[PDB]
RNA sequence: UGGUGACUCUAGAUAACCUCGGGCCGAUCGCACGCCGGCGGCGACGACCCAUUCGAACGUCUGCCCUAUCAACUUUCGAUGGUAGUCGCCGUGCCUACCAUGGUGACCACGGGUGACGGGGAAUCAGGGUUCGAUUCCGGAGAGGGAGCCUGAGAAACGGCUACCACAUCCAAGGAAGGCAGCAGGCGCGCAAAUUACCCACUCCCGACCCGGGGAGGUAGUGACGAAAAAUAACAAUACAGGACUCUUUCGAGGCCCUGUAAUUGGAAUGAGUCCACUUUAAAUCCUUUAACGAGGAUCCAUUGGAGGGCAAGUCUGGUGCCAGCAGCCGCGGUAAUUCCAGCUCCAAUAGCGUAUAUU
RNA sequence: UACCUGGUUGAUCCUGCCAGUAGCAUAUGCUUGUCUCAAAGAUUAAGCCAUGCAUGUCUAAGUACGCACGGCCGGUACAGUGAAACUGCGAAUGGCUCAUUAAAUCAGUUAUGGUUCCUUUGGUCGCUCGUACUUGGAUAACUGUGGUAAUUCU
């Protein structure tokens, strides 16, 4: 409709198995526009399967017309979930992270460097 | 200090490796290698800032760990190995070559050569020692070592060596009206020819350079490489041609491009 | 040990004598014709002339050959003609020399909104200026001080996202229509 | 008496608006004067005014934005 | 006869009246050493946590200019603040420390 | 043979030596498996020596503040030099043995002081200067005070060890343990300085390492140190007051304009805030983008210092009467206070403005 | 912006200082709506420290008889994941602070032809004329018995 997406910067990186691009998207009365819907149109520009595209800061300028973010499309679902940071991956739902502070991990390795032996496994 | 250091701040390093301010505190600190600190790029600073095919450094520990870089012919998984002057980079996923030579600013260049140019290297021979068994010793500039190098050879020459084999192809004479680059000083990065050599004893000699618009310049004797028999390179130079242009004709030829196309 | 900066700048000066009958009177008829908040902005127009002038006789004492005379007069030739400060025809330092703070004054957002006719007095050029109703052709200025180059003059539009600029009403008239 | 040297000094309070927020044996903040180590220009001997009482200023005792602690 | 007062205080005003009554009661008896602490600021969200800590802190300000407030909520919280009232320089009466009591 | 500017350099030849507290000459581990029991291609880990890299350490020349109420200093117990050695990674009084009597000084030695870590640098700045640099970069030093070590390539290491001195912890009284000038935090000291928060996503570092770790570092919190941008209104009609223009000698007349001032009306525009969503991000917050609500006393109320002169702005009014006080200085106050305390008005800067001190 | 003003005398002219004036840093007082950056227990006490954290580390490639788990196929030495522990490396970098220090440190300039070096990179690694189709003894981890009020003791 009235929300468009071009890309500016192409790059063709063989070496990571990736399309790398920058994404300038304009709407020019409305929010800024959800990754999810940019992902969906990159996918009906580049013909692929919308779920190896990762996009990311994302900045609107001031006014509102513009935003331009950064966006890569991987060859295939097994690169991405190689080449990707681990944080990307899980806010497209595709990697969980244990529960715990650093607090209770240092403060438990602390805790069994006062055990030698197979009990350093019997500190909780 | 009590032991050797670790880390290089931010600041404190290579101008001519163009690193900004408020990216981090740190510099990648180059590993020790066959080329100096303040005279080298590390891998990290070429794949990352200079050909963009990374934006992080787990990513060039990516690219690296892939096998992909060859550096002189063999493959380095080190993200912050020193490549330094005259240093073949082939990537053969992507098929490019690269050689590091100056830009005229005193800069590494992104100088993209054909696959058979990647086949050899010139490097300026630092010294010459008889070894164990009368066996001459030929060391390069950047901590080759060579048996058996040809009884012409001296000490400030060029050679052109294979990079497969590692021995020497051809040699080029430190004489006057040879063509060379300077690796040091003031006027890094500019190309001529060799007009003298002001020998000091107990001190530095001094090489006066032409270059091809007319223009003179000295240099110390440890800044001169010899790169060409009398006029022509035996390498290929990079978009400019070793002539350091005015801040004046820098602004016409700007002036000039945009006039041109925009 | 911060990836942090700390390049900073005063960007005004305040003057020697404080109380002063005439310089009172020149800053606060300043302040009048161009719509200025206070004595601040005056003082900061000051100081980039003053700026701007050292520069130009440090120049002249040079000889009139000097690669780097050259060089830094016409960069600061090109850069005074640019924003519309000196004409394209008094390309010479000593014009650099006789430039006035009023020309620095008159070539701010807010004058330039009040002289091409989108406000009805400096001041309302200022409010207009700062309520996002004024555009520099493309982009939404909130400055009054944005100083307007030459090619930006025929390019100050009105705010197409604005009611009275592309036409949605403004919260007083949309509460006041429904009223009835 | 100051407390980090033991040393007596004499300290000007303004007036009886002031002089009367100070009782015996309370903790005063004091400053000099005002001509770097000399004088008042009518009473002699005191280089130093009174500041604060009772940690809290002597303008907001006298201007009423606060009272001060006993 | 008390060593410390905890003066518990509002996450979202200062005080009642009837507070700044007991407040100009005892500081014209005469304070002893003093700690403040809030009671409620986890009720809140973390913006409206963060920006009425600041709002309180203003309220306060014009009567005690220069304390940290600290926060009871949980234990650990009830912890540090013992320990923040074991370990704090003792302001000293005047009237009570001549004679016995 | 080869090199240098110069070797007692490198290389060569001879005669030997070659340390058990001992010098190299591979009893190591993985992946594809294949050619004529045999041959094997990739790597990993070591490995005496040489070169290289990162340096380190000792030297060369020149460059430092105040002081003569510091004018002579050093020399058994090394001060200056010579010979041989010891020790050292190495040059060397580094040390020892034997000799010489030297070495420094009004061109300021020696001694003392410093509110002295040095430098890049910072403030001010006509020109010349003066003051500062604990502090993120480089170098040095130290881990409560000294001293001695182990391991290691590298430490006289202190988030290593052993003593003594000064502190201080636990105790069943026999014993044991310690070092926040790391990050938070506390006490004390003071005029004087933040949270016992989140994370390795960025910058890089370390390790057997693409995978682990990092109070290095990043992110929030406090933060009027300081620097930048910038609200607290704008417009229209009406009513008075001026200035121009036309006709008038003039007074006067102008739906003749322009500009002000409102105890006068009017709807138009927006942020401050409240609060969906998106974006941001390691997850957040903030900013930016957008719905909804959100202004006439637009009470959604701008302060801090002043009004005799210097120095801009009152000889107004009420109170006090050399008192209370003000006042950097000159001065005001003793019954008509331009200066004290207030009301009103005015002035200067403005989200800032006074005061003390250091310094230019 | 190369700048002055007030104060001694009855009055004038002056030497001369004090006072004013503007910046910069520390503290402080009153006030404080928005937003971008941003210093921050240095001065006094290189004073003293409760508690928590700040240095650890595994690849196909040193050592795997912990069923701690685990597909086989069923004599296949060890499939594979892997705590522990031995071994190797790092812990000498970083961070903090400015007490000492007055030709000392440090800055520039030179020298190592007077020295040392983990690591990286390159060379060298049948150059020696003299049980090997594989050598020996232990010690952890594991199992079991314990001592002390107490320890990262053993």
Redesign the pocket.
């Given at each position: 409709d009235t929300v468009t997406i071009r890309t500016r910067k192409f790059m063709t990186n063989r070496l990571l198995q990736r399309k790398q691009m920058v994404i300038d998207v304009l709407?020019?009365?409305?929010?800024?526009?959800?990754?999810?819907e940019?992902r969906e149109k990159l996918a009906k520009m580049y013909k692929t399967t919308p779920d190896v595209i990762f996009?990311?800061?994302?900045?609107?300028?001031?006014?509102?017309?513009k935003?331009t973010?950064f966006g890569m499309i991987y060859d295939s679902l097994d690169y991405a979930k190689?080449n990707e940071?681990?944080?990307?991956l899980?806010?497209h739902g595709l990697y969980e992270?244990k529960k715990?502070?650093?607090?209770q991990?240092?403060?438990?390795?602390?805790?069994?460097?006062?055990?030698?032996?197979?009990?350093?496994?019997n500190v909780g | 200090?009590?032991?050797?250091?670790?880390?290089?701040?931010?600041?404190?390093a290579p101008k001519h490796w163009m690193?900004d301010k408020?990216?981090?505190?740190?510099?990648?600190?180059?590993?020790?290698?066959?080329?100096?600190?303040?005279?080298?790029l590390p891998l990290?600073?070429f794949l990352?800032?200079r050909l963009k095919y990374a934006?992080?450094?787990?990513?060039?520990?990516?690219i690296?760990?892939?096998?992909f870089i060859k550096i002189?012919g063999?493959?380095?998984?080190?993200?912050?190995?020193?490549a330094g002057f005259m240093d073949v980079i082939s990537i053969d996923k992507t098929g490019e070559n690269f050689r590091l030579i100056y830009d005229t600013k005193g800069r590494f260049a992104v100088h993209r050569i054909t696959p058979e140019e990647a086949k050899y290297k010139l490097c300026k021979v630092?010294?010459?020692?008889?070894?164990?068994?009368?066996?001459?010793?030929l060391?390069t500039h950047?901590?080759?070592?060579?048996?058996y190098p040809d009884?012409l050879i001296?000490?400030n020459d060029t050679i052109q060596i294979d990079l497969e084999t590692?021995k020497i192809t051809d040699f080029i004479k430190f004489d006057t009206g040879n063509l060379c680059m300077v690796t040091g000083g003031a006027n890094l990065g500019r190309i001529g020819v060799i007009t003298n050599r002001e020998?000091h004893?107990?001190?530095?000699?001094v090489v006066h350079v032409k270059d091809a618009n007319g223009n003179s310049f000295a240099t110390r004797l440890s800044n001169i490489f010899v790169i060409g028999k009398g006029n022509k390179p035996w390498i290929s130079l990079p978009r400019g041609k070793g002539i350091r242009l005015t801040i004046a004709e820098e602004r016409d030829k700007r002036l000039a491009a945009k006039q041109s196309s925009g | 040990?911060?990836?942090?900066?700390?390049?900073?700048?005063?960007?005004?000066?305040?003057?020697?004598?404080?109380?002063?009958?005439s310089?009172?009177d020149q800053?606060?008829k300043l302040i009048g014709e161009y719509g200025l908040?206070?004595?601040?902005?005056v003082?900061?127009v000051?100081?980039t002339?003053?700026k701007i002038?050292?520069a130009a006789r440090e120049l002249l004492t040079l000889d009139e050959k000097d690669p780097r005379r050259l060089f830094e007069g016409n960069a600061l030739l090109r850069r005074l003609v640019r924003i519309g400060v000196l004409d394209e025809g008094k390309m010479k330092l000593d014009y650099i020399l006789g430039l006035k703070i009023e020309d620095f004054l008159e070539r701010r957002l807010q004058t330039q909104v009040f002289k091409l006719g989108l406000?009805?007095?400096?001041?309302?050029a200022?409010?207009?200026?700062?309520?996002?109703?004024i555009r520099v052709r493309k982009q939404?200025v909130?400055?009054?001080?944005?100083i307007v180059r030459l090619d930006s003059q025929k390019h100050i539009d009105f705010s197409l996202?604005?009611?009275?600029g592309g036409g949605?009403?403004?919260?007083?008239?949309?509460?006041?229509?429904?009223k009835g | 008496q100051?407390?980090?040297?033991g040393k007596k000094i004499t300290a000007?309070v303004?007036?009886?608006?002031?002089?009367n927020f100070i009782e015996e044996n309370d903790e005063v903040?004091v400053?000099?004067?005002?001509?770097?180590?000399?004088?008042?220009?009518?009473?002699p001997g005191v280089?130093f005014?009174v500041?604060?009482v009772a940690?809290?200023?002597?303008?907001?005792l006298?201007?009423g934005?606060?009272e001060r602690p006993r | 006869v008390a060593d410390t007062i905890l003066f518990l205080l509002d996450p979202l005003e200062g005080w009642d009246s009837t507070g700044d009554y007991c407040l100009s009661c005892l500081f014209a008896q005469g304070l002893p050493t003093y700690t403040l602490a809030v009671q409620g600021i986890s009720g809140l969200?973390?913006?409206?946590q963060?920006?009425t800590?600041?709002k309180l802190?203003?309220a306060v300000?014009?009567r005690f200019?220069?304390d940290?407030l600290?926060?009871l909520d949980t234990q650990?919280?009830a912890?540090?603040l013992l320990?923040?009232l074991a370990?704090?320089?003792?302001q000293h009466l005047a009237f009570r420390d001549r004679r016995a009591y």
């Open positions: 709407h020019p009365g409305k929010a800024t526009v959800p990754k999810t940019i996009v990311f800061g994302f900045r609107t300028h001031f006014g509102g017309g935003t973010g190689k940071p681990k944080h990307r899980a806010r992270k715990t502070s650093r607090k991990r240092k403060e438990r390795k602390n805790r069994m460097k006062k055990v030698r032996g197979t009990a350093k496994a | 200090a009590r032991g050797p250091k670790k880390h290089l701040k931010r600041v404190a690193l408020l990216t981090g505190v740190f510099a990648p600190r180059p590993s020790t290698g066959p080329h100096k600190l303040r005279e080298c990290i600073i990352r800032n934006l992080t450094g787990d990513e060039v520990k990516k690296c760990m892939q096998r002189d063999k493959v380095r998984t080190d993200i912050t190995y020193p630092r010294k010459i020692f008889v070894g164990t068994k009368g066996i001459p010793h060391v950047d901590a080759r070592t060579i048996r009884p001296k000490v590692g020998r004893p107990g001190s530095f000699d | 040990p911060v990836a942090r900066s700390w390049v900073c700048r005063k960007t005004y000066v305040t003057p020697r004598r404080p109380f002063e009958k310089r009172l800053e606060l908040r206070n004595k601040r902005e003082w900061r000051k100081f002339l003053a002038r050292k406000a009805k007095s400096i001041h309302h200022r409010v207009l200026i700062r309520q996002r109703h939404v909130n400055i009054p001080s944005f996202r604005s009611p009275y949605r009403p403004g919260r007083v008239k949309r509460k006041n229509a429904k | 100051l407390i980090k040297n000007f303004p007036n009886d608006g002031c002089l903040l400053a000099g004067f005002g001509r770097k180590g000399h004088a008042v220009g009518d009473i280089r005014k500041v604060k940690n809290v200023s002597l303008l907001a006298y201007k934005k606060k | 969200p973390l913006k409206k963060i920006d800590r600041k802190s203003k300000e014009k200019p220069h940290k600290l926060l650990q919280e912890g540090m320990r923040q370990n704090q320089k003792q």
